[PDB]
């Protein structure tokens, strides 16, 4: 309706939800690399 | 640091130089790695030339000097001026025209 209403509706709920999810995406990246590294060693053991 | 420099020899009032490849931090006249040539600063004159033109005798092993400049040898200012005349390096100094 007015500037005050539209400006009050907006809050950090979206910004907070974004930062937290982003940190989890890079966390899953570290897990993906670690999980991948374990695969590169698993196929080498049974190979030899 | 390898350097292409001059080793002052001769007698009093009779300078004579050896172009040498030596490590920077060594005595000027110590035995170098190689002797690339010689350099006489006093200009000479042709025997039967009455024109008055002078010249300077400089013996230099250009092939051996190019290899050391290629691997990273640092010639002194005097040896740089000589190597620039023969056409190996670019002059460091030039006469201002203005």
């Amino acid at each position: 309706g007015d500037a005050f209403q539209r400006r009050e509706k907006a809050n950090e709920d979206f910004a907070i939800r974004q930062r937290e999810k982003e940190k989890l995406l890079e966390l899953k990246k570290k897990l993906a690399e670690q999980q991948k590294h374990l695969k590169t060693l698993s196929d080498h053991i049974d190979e030899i | 640091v390898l350097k292409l420099r001059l080793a002052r020899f001769g007698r009093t009032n009779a300078p004579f130089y050896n172009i040498v490849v030596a490590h920077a931090r060594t005595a000027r006249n110590s035995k170098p790695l190689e002797v690339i040539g010689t350099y006489d600063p006093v200009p000479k004159k042709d025997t039967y030339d009455t024109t008055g033109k002078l010249h300077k005798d400089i013996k230099l092993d250009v092939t051996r000097a190019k290899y050391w400049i290629g691997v990273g040898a640092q010639p002194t200012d005097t040896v740089w001026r000589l190597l620039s005349l023969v056409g190996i390096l670019d002059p460091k100094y030039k006469k201002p025209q203005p």
């Binding site: 007015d2 500037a3 005050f4 400006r7 950090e12 | -």
Partner: protein
């Protein structure tokens, strides 16, 4: 370099309790060498410190330091700073902020981001604007940096109110104009005032503080109040100089301040979201607090500039003033009764006193 912090002028016992608590356990330890400062917080040396407590010669009289339980004995800096700040009621009291903020700066205490805006308000309303401007000038010592868009907006509010409180007299309006310019020059040149907290707020607004249209309107207000008085030969050579700046600043504000955009639409939409970044402007109480002089400046400048024969500016400034007035009137309806903003706007714009 500087003298040791001291609090020897306190009108109340409560104030002395808060200042001496921080002094003897948060400030004075900072004057010890880095080695001895580690023994005071180590149990293994508790016995030694009991017999021969560490001493430092300040004003001759040594200051003894004994073991301090880092968890149980250390005081709460935010709360003690509040107890002291709320008990200051005399010029002799507020003079301690210069030493208090210096001590916290030495202790590397990350004070609340809003603490500056609070000190400026409670101190300026008491009639001690100089103590603030002196700490700002001596930022190398007090760490009183202008890194918040609110502090600069709060500081420039009082610099004008003091001039407005005297009906914009020449002796005072000349003084205020010197203060406003000293701040816009410190924000631009002085590097002590720059920090990550400021770079973020300047990215949300897209204007640097020294060019933010909200802050430039302050300098335009005082200037517009100097030309209105005359627009004696010495005064004429000076009055003629104010008009050169008026048309200079006004012609610059219109270039930065977009068209048909008020104070809440001036900056990006993402600027009013974070509570640590320019969210105070959403509350009608705080909007009328800053949109009062800014609205009065655009109106006054629009009239003088119009008289000089500047059609464009006469219409450009009225464009902004019309935009700020439409928004300001909304805040006047949503604001609760008995609020500061409703009173200031009623006094400055309404002229009801």
């Amino acid at each position: 370099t500087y003298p040791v912090v001291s609090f020897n002028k306190t009108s109340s016992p409560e104030l002395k309790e808060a200042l001496e608590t921080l002094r003897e356990k948060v400030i004075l330890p900072t004057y010890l060498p880095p080695e001895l400062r580690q023994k005071i917080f180590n149990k293994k040396y508790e016995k030694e410190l009991a017999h021969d407590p560490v001493t430092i010669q300040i004003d001759g009289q040594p200051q003894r330091f004994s073991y301090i339980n880092m968890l149980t004995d250390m005081p709460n800096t935010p709360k003690n700073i509040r107890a002291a700040l709320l008990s200051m009621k005399n010029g002799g009291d507020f003079a301690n902020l210069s030493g208090l903020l210096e001590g916290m700066h030495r202790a590397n205490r990350k004070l609340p981001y809003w603490l500056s805006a609070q000190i400026v308000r409670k101190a300026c309303k008491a009639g001690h604007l100089q103590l603030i401007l002196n700490m700002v000038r001596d930022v190398k010592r007090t760490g009183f940096t202008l890194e918040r868009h609110e502090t600069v907006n709060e500081l420039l509010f009082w610099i004008q109110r003091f001039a407005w409180k005297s009906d914009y007299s020449e002796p005072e309006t000349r003084k205020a104009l010197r203060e406003v310019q000293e701040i816009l020059d410190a924000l631009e040149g002085d590097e002590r005032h720059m920090s990550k907290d400021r770079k973020r707020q300047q990215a949300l607004t897209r204007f640097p503080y020294h060019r933010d249209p909200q802050f430039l309107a302050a300098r335009l207000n005082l200037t517009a109040e100097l030309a209105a008085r005359r627009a004696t030969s010495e005064q004429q050579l000076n009055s003629a100089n104010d008009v050169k700046n008026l048309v200079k600043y006004a012609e610059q504000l219109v270039r930065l301040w977009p068209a048909d955009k008020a104070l809440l639409d001036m900056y990006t939409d993402e600027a009013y979201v974070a509570r640590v970044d320019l969210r105070y402007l959403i509350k009608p109480q705080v909007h009328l607090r800053y949109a009062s002089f800014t609205l009065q400046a655009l109106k006054n400048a629009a009239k003088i500039v119009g008289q000089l024969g500047h059609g464009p500016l006469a219409a450009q400034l009225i464009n902004r003033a019309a935009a700020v007035e439409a928004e300001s009137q909304l805040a006047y309806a949503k604001v609760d009764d008995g609020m500061a903003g409703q009173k200031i706007y009623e006094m400055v714009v309404g002229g009801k006193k």
